[PDB]
Design a protein around this motif. Sequence first.
Motif, PDB file in Angstrom:
ATOM      1  N   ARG A 126     -21.062 -71.326  14.840  1.00 42.98           N
ATOM      2  CA  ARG A 126     -20.165 -71.850  15.867  1.00 42.98           C
ATOM      3  C   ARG A 126     -19.897 -70.808  16.950  1.00 42.98           C
ATOM      4  N   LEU A 127     -19.093 -69.813  16.604  1.00 45.83           N
ATOM      5  CA  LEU A 127     -18.661 -68.796  17.548  1.00 45.83           C
ATOM      6  C   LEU A 127     -18.068 -67.635  16.767  1.00 45.83           C
ATOM      7  N   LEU A 128     -18.439 -66.416  17.125  1.00 50.42           N
ATOM      8  CA  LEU A 128     -17.991 -65.255  16.379  1.00 50.42           C
ATOM      9  C   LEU A 128     -17.785 -64.045  17.275  1.00 50.42           C
ATOM     10  N   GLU A 129     -17.033 -63.091  16.750  1.00 43.42           N
ATOM     11  CA  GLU A 129     -16.861 -61.782  17.360  1.00 43.42           C
ATOM     12  C   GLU A 129     -16.902 -60.730  16.267  1.00 43.42           C
ATOM     13  N   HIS A 130     -17.191 -59.501  16.638  1.00 43.92           N
ATOM     14  CA  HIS A 130     -17.081 -58.391  15.714  1.00 43.92           C
ATOM     15  C   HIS A 130     -15.889 -57.534  16.111  1.00 43.92           C
ATOM     16  N   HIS A 131     -14.701 -58.042  15.820  1.00 43.59           N
ATOM     17  CA  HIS A 131     -13.473 -57.451  16.327  1.00 43.59           C
ATOM     18  C   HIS A 131     -12.756 -56.654  15.243  1.00 43.59           C
ATOM     19  N   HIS A 132     -13.223 -55.435  15.015  1.00 42.28           N
ATOM     20  CA  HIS A 132     -12.593 -54.532  14.058  1.00 42.28           C
ATOM     21  C   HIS A 132     -12.097 -53.285  14.766  1.00 42.28           C
ATOM     22  N   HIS A 133     -10.787 -53.108  14.794  1.00 42.60           N
ATOM     23  CA  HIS A 133     -10.194 -51.973  15.478  1.00 42.60           C
ATOM     24  C   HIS A 133      -9.562 -51.023  14.471  1.00 42.60           C
ATOM     25  N   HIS A 134     -10.282 -49.967  14.148  1.00 43.25           N
ATOM     26  CA  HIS A 134      -9.825 -48.999  13.164  1.00 43.25           C
ATOM     27  C   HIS A 134      -9.169 -47.814  13.860  1.00 43.25           C
ATOM     28  N   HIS A 135      -7.868 -47.648  13.629  1.00 39.36           N
ATOM     29  CA  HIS A 135      -7.120 -46.531  14.202  1.00 39.36           C
ATOM     30  C   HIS A 135      -7.729 -45.207  13.758  1.00 39.36           C
TER      31      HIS A 135
ATOM     32  N   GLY B  37      -8.008 -58.385   8.380  1.00 41.18           N
ATOM     33  CA  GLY B  37      -9.244 -57.637   8.457  1.00 41.18           C
ATOM     34  C   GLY B  37      -9.687 -57.433   9.887  1.00 41.18           C
ATOM     35  N   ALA B  38      -9.409 -58.416  10.725  1.00 43.26           N
ATOM     36  CA  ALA B  38      -9.721 -58.321  12.138  1.00 43.26           C
ATOM     37  C   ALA B  38      -8.677 -57.472  12.854  1.00 43.26           C
ATOM     38  N   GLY B  39      -8.990 -57.067  14.079  1.00 44.22           N
ATOM     39  CA  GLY B  39      -8.058 -56.281  14.869  1.00 44.22           C
ATOM     40  C   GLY B  39      -6.761 -57.020  15.153  1.00 44.22           C
TER      41      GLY B  39
ATOM     42  N   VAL C 142       1.276 -86.871  -1.223  1.00 45.87           N
ATOM     43  CA  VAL C 142       1.681 -85.849  -0.278  1.00 45.87           C
ATOM     44  C   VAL C 142       0.552 -85.506   0.692  1.00 45.87           C
ATOM     45  N   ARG C 143       0.916 -85.332   1.948  1.00 46.70           N
ATOM     46  CA  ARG C 143       0.004 -84.814   2.947  1.00 46.70           C
ATOM     47  C   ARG C 143       0.134 -83.303   3.014  1.00 46.70           C
ATOM     48  N   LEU C 144      -0.973 -82.612   2.872  1.00 46.88           N
ATOM     49  CA  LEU C 144      -0.984 -81.167   3.017  1.00 46.88           C
ATOM     50  C   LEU C 144      -1.707 -80.782   4.291  1.00 46.88           C
ATOM     51  N   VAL C 145      -1.005 -80.065   5.138  1.00 47.59           N
ATOM     52  CA  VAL C 145      -1.567 -79.581   6.378  1.00 47.59           C
ATOM     53  C   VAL C 145      -1.652 -78.068   6.333  1.00 47.59           C
ATOM     54  N   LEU C 146      -2.865 -77.562   6.218  1.00 49.46           N
ATOM     55  CA  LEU C 146      -3.085 -76.133   6.225  1.00 49.46           C
ATOM     56  C   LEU C 146      -3.272 -75.682   7.661  1.00 49.46           C
ATOM     57  N   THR C 147      -2.300 -74.949   8.161  1.00 47.52           N
ATOM     58  CA  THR C 147      -2.336 -74.475   9.523  1.00 47.52           C
ATOM     59  C   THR C 147      -2.411 -72.962   9.535  1.00 47.52           C
ATOM     60  N   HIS C 148      -3.600 -72.418   9.702  1.00 49.35           N
ATOM     61  CA  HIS C 148      -3.717 -70.974   9.764  1.00 49.35           C
ATOM     62  C   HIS C 148      -3.471 -70.541  11.198  1.00 49.35           C
ATOM     63  N   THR C 149      -2.322 -69.934  11.413  1.00 46.31           N
ATOM     64  CA  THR C 149      -1.850 -69.592  12.737  1.00 46.31           C
ATOM     65  C   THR C 149      -2.167 -68.146  13.088  1.00 46.31           C
ATOM     66  N   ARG C 150      -1.928 -67.797  14.352  1.00 48.73           N
ATOM     67  CA  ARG C 150      -2.007 -66.413  14.818  1.00 48.73           C
ATOM     68  C   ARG C 150      -3.446 -65.899  14.790  1.00 48.73           C
ATOM     69  N   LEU C 151      -4.399 -66.817  14.864  1.00 41.25           N
ATOM     70  CA  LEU C 151      -5.803 -66.439  14.927  1.00 41.25           C
ATOM     71  C   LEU C 151      -6.167 -66.009  16.343  1.00 41.25           C
ATOM     72  N   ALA C 152      -6.797 -64.850  16.461  1.00 41.03           N
ATOM     73  CA  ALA C 152      -7.202 -64.328  17.759  1.00 41.03           C
ATOM     74  C   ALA C 152      -8.273 -65.209  18.393  1.00 41.03           C
ATOM     75  N   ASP C 153      -9.174 -65.726  17.562  1.00 37.86           N
ATOM     76  CA  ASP C 153     -10.252 -66.595  18.022  1.00 37.86           C
ATOM     77  C   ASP C 153     -11.062 -67.038  16.812  1.00 37.86           C
ATOM     78  N   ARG C 154     -12.232 -67.620  17.051  1.00 40.07           N
ATOM     79  CA  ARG C 154     -13.077 -68.127  15.974  1.00 40.07           C
ATOM     80  C   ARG C 154     -13.524 -66.990  15.060  1.00 40.07           C
ATOM     81  N   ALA C 155     -13.534 -65.776  15.597  1.00 41.58           N
ATOM     82  CA  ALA C 155     -13.858 -64.595  14.808  1.00 41.58           C
ATOM     83  C   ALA C 155     -12.857 -64.402  13.677  1.00 41.58           C
ATOM     84  N   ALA C 156     -11.601 -64.723  13.950  1.00 40.91           N
ATOM     85  CA  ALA C 156     -10.548 -64.532  12.973  1.00 40.91           C
ATOM     86  C   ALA C 156     -10.683 -65.554  11.852  1.00 40.91           C
TER      87      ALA C 156
END
Length: 191
Positions: free
Chosen positions: A182-191, A108-110, A127-141
């Motif tokens: 915490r911290l946010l951005e409005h990072h929506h880049h619509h072609h 949804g983000a740019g 079992v240990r489950l580690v949820l790692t959400h990667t490739r986040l641009a920043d806290r906005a993502a």
Amino acid sequence: MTSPSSAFPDGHGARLDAQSIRFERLLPGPIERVWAWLADADKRARWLAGGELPRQPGQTFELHFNHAALTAETAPARYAQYDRPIVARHTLLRCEPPRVLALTWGGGAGEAPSEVLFELSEAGEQVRLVLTHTRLADRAAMLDVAGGWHAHLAVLAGKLAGQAPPPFWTTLAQAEQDYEQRLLEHHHHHH
């Protein structure tokens, strides 16, 4: 349908912050059992979203973003669009059972859609489950996915424990309130 009443796991709130999503939790069962919920599209549509797996890593599968992409049934009406099952295709990165699986999430983000690493470690019975959400641009993502995503970890534990699920909207909005503060951005880049 696999639903085991095994044990009731506790948890810890994530302190500090991260530029990605970091959640390590403990689940009942060795590791293959917990994987079932990740693989089976039938039950997964009741704790996340329905959509079986393809054959190749790098291929795209089509799943449905259901009510809040977990469950709603009754909503504060401030969603509506997010209260319908929207089908979309998504790329899977790796699926190496039973250990690690990875996909890419809603972009949804740019820029390119951020990815999700599910990393299971198998303990002496649990079992240990580690949820790692990667490739986040920043806290906005992480705030972009914050709309439902993190909260799924509550229903997971609920199901995997064999207990009832918690108030979804309450948990969602509460965590949303945290992230939004915490911290946010409005990072929506619509072609």
